[PDB]
């Protein structure tokens, strides 16, 4: 039937148009600019404009939030679309905005909003429709309550508006339709996708699902840093799906009145059960249900057990879903981890630079910034921040710009607001000052992501790269050969060789190439974890790696354990042995299903305990030879990007003079040369300033700053300190150890 068409999100940003695929326009006989009467629920009829967009599938009609509000429907609904081009030019429209816009403005929406929005717009208008216009800061809503002719009219020169009168309140159900939606979230594609996938079907078709006879999931927990928008996520999902979201705060529950809390708790549970499929949200469960041995009194135990009983007694019953928010899964009582109880857990990681840019773009929407905004490096430098931090930064920058406008000598009591709001811009100095007044909350916390180092970045030992990619990419991409032949692929590979050879560089490069998550573990942190906090840290780090499959776990200072094992300390040996035993047991505990690889690196392989070098354990071992000439020239040309390239000389003879030197030596030499170049530029600029101040207008001819020519003299003053970073005899010791292995 060419009537119904299921709805979908719109990619077009225009309010009064929708995206149509070519076969649908051909079948319905509609063209560009033709008005169509979408008939939905509640006897709601809307006039929209057809646009050509084959991106949308035939069965799905792209349709954004404003049209959804006008049609009074949700996603996945059914709406009949039919031709209806008989709209007539209008004469008058009496329109009243939302009442929640005169909050200290008292302006005229006709010029500030209506003129920018409807300049040569030719939008179609119907009685009672709801739309939005973004302004300086407020996305002001507007409802037309009278039109002539009724109900169809189009934006046209022959239009007179009656925008006079106290603005009406929001239209009942639309009160919550002011904000909160899927568009309001950034950097959470996978998590949101999972949540939608496993929540939509039970909620959209509860009766159908119950008639099928499949149990619905009931335990969903989310853990992450505070301020990551977990409550925002829950609210958005509940608002989108359609339910009776009933927030329950944490702290107040304990301190209401002695032991009356469970009364209110069960009252809330009952009324939620009384009010159709609803989502019941609980926050900071640790404040309610901490670890059992943390508990001091008894009333908290009573509350915890009451909650257990209440949530366990809701098996089937109604289509009510429990939403839980917390920070750390460990702090919660494990008793709330059984099946039927909370069973599905989601981590909310810190967004990356792209996620930070997305969040800023979401926040930086109403305000009109100046035409200099460069959010890219701003996001890059602002790692370690959350959505709350970026929102605070945006608000602070807005206030700084406001005060940079200065209080322009007025008693600003609804007198200058309209003039200021429509005339604003945001300077980069505002963002600089915000960066100065910035206190990231994450700071000292691990981050898992895909590194950036590429193969060409290394420039050397392509044989090792070939072997690594052979051992890594082939099994996951070609499991058919392995199952046909029947061998278990290796899981751990060790690296040994002279220090300063970029073993971590290779690890990052292979992780980036594999497009998998990366985790770095530092030896000092391990040695800190030796005393006391060892077991839980190992368990949580391996679990975090496991849930992020596929990923490449990495280790550093793998010989530090043995370095402290034998020496003049003799203190952490028991703790070290415990840690290494835990690591060995847990890595023995992994299942081959999880496509997570492990990489260990060291420069003193002899001192390593043989138990690590065992089947199942780290068995594949790779030596890293020192760079030489081709490798030296390659690393030189890979590190020599900079802005001041000058014209340089032959890299081959530079490698020749520095034979038997690691890449660290070359990098240090380059940095020292750059330091001398900076010193020369600084002293020359200072001398030029001195001759300007002693001789006014001495250099009236506009000559640029001294050229950043890093000349061979700079190279000479660089490799004056031609460092023999690596010892000589130890190279023979390492190759002798390798040959001892090379039986």
């Amino acid at each position: 039937r060419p009537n119904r068409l299921i709805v979908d999100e719109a990619i077009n940003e225009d309010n009064s148009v929708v995206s149509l695929s070519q076969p649908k326009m051909d079948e319905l006989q509609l063209f560009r600019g033709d008005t169509v009467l979408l008939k939905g629920k509640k006897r709601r009829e809307a006039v929209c404009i057809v646009l050509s967009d084959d991106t949308c599938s035939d069965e799905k009609i792209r349709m954004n939030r404003v049209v959804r509000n006008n049609l009074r429907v949700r996603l996945g609904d059914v709406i009949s679309i039919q031709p209806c081009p008989d709209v007539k030019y209008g004469k008058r429209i009496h329109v009243l905005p939302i009442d929640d816009t005169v909050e200290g403005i008292t302006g005229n929406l006709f010029e500030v909003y209506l003129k920018p929005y409807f300049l040569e717009a030719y939008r179609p208008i119907r009685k009672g429709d709801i739309f939005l216009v973004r302004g300086g800061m407020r996305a002001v809503e507007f409802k037309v309550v009278e039109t002539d002719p009724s109900p169809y009219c189009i934006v046209a020169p022959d239009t007179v508006i009656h925008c006079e009168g106290e603005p009406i309140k929001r239209e009942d159900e639309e009160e919550s339709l002011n904000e909160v939606g899927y568009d309001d979230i950034g950097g959470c594609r996978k998590q949101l996708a999972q949540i939608k996938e496993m929540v939509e079907l039970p909620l959209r078709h509860p009766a159908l699902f119950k008639a099928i006879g499949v149990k619905p999931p009931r335990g969903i927990l989310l853990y992450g840093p505070p301020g990551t928008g977990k409550t925002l996520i829950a609210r958005a999902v509940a608002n989108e799906t359609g339910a009776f979201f009933f927030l329950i705060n944490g702290p107040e529950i304990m301190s209401k009145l002695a032991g009356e809390s469970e009364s209110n708790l069960r009252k809330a549970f009952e009324e939620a059960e009384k009010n159709a499929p609803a989502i019941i949200f609980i926050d900071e469960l640790d404040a309610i249900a901490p670890k059992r041995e943390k508990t001091h009194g008894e009333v908290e135990r009573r509350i915890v057990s009451q909650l257990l009983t209440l949530m366990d007694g809701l098996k089937q019953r109604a289509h009510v879903i429990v939403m839980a928010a917390t920070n750390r899964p460990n702090s919660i009582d494990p008793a709330l981890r059984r099946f039927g109880r909370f069973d599905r857990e989601v981590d909310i990681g810190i967004p990356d630079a792209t996620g930070r840019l997305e969040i800023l773009q979401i926040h930086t929407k109403n305000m009109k910034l100046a035409d200099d905004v460069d959010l890219e490096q701003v996001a890059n430098e602002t790692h370690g921040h959350v959505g709350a931090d970026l929102a605070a930064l945006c608000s602070e920058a807005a206030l700084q710009a406001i005060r940079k406008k200065m209080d322009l000598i007025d008693l600003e009591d609804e007198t200058i607001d309209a003039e200021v709001m429509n005339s604003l811009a945001v300077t980069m100095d505002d963002f600089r000052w915000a960066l100065s007044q910035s206190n990231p909350s994450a700071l000292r916390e691990t981050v898992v992501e895909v590194p950036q180092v590429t193969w060409e970045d290394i420039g050397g030992l392509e044989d090792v790269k070939r072997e690594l990619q052979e051992l890594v990419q082939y099994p996951v991409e070609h499991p058919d050969k392995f199952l046909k032949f029947g061998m278990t692929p290796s899981k751990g590979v060790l690296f040994y060789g002279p220090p300063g050879c970029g073993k971590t560089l290779l690890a990052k490069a292979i992780a980036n190439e594999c497009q998998a998550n990366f985790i770095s573990i530092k030896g000092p942190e391990l040695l800190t974890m030796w005393f006391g906090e060892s077991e839980a840290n190992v368990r949580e780090i391996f679990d975090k790696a496991r849930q992020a499959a596929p990923c490449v776990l990495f280790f550093d200072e793998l010989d530090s354990i043995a370095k402290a094992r034998g020496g003049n300390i003799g203190d952490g040996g028991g703790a070290a042995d415990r840690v290494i035993n835990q690591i060995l047991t847990e890595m023995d505990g992994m299942s081959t299903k999880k496509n997570v690889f492990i990489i260990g690196a060291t420069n003193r392989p002899d001192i390593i305990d043989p138990a690590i070098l065992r089947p199942g354990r780290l068995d594949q071992l790779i030596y890293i030879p020192l760079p030489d000439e081709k490798s030296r020239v390659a690393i030189l040309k890979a590190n020599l990007r900079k802005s001041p390239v000058a014209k340089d000389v032959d890299l081959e003879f530079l490698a020749k003079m520095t034979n038997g030197f690691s890449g660290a030596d070359l990098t240090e030499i380059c940095q020292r040369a750059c330091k001398l170049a900076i010193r020369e530029s600084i002293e020359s600029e200072i001398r030029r300033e001195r001759e300007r101040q002693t001789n006014p207008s001495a250099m009236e001819v506009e000559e640029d700053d001294p050229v950043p020519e890093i000349r061979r003299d700079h190279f000479e003053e660089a490799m004056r300190f031609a460092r023999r970073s690596v010892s000589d005899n130890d190279i023979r010791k390492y190759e002798m150890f390798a040959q001892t292995l090379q039986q």
């Binding site: 008058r92 009496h94 006709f110 209506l114 409807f118 300049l119 040569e120 009278e146 046209a156 020169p157 239009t159 007179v160 508006i161 009656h162 925008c163 006079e164 009168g165």
Partner: protein, 225 residues
Amino acid sequence: MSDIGDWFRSIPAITRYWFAATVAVPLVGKLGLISPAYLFLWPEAFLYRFQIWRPITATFYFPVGPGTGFLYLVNLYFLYQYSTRLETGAFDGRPADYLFMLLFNWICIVITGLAMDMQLLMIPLIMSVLYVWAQLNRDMIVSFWFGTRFKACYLPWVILGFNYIIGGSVINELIGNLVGHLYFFLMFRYPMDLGGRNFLSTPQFLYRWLPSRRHNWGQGFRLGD
């Protein structure tokens, strides 16, 4: 509580005069010069014998005395939380149609009271319009400030017993119920199915004042393109 004062003061002149008369007929009738016994509403008496004293005055009879005056108080109290809802509920945006529908319903109820020979008229009308109003407001619990144990499905017969214990001839209120049913018929069933003659007429007196009936769109601004 004593929030009725703001409600009364906020009312405009014409509507406040209407409601002031509607509620103050008994206190006016208690002037002391004329006994309430002279308004017993005997249609047979006026039809057959002279009964000059009850041309239309018998249609607004409410006995209130020394032992009922305090009870009189709570009576008007009900009317307050009646009118406040009744004006807001059902018909709220039709001031002229308000008077029209009151007039037609009063004609119907006075006709059916002419059929009978009972005594009270305004209480049956009030309860009739009450039930026809609440039939569109059923299945709702409302509790006032000084009340926390208000149960369900008890109010109508409790009030029935309240008016039963003080006085008698209960069946009269039923006739009031009757017109409400007809009035219910008059928004859900009358003007689409029967198609017969209409006994109601709307005089031009209502259209002469037209109390609010505001529909102008203030003023308009030239747009252009």
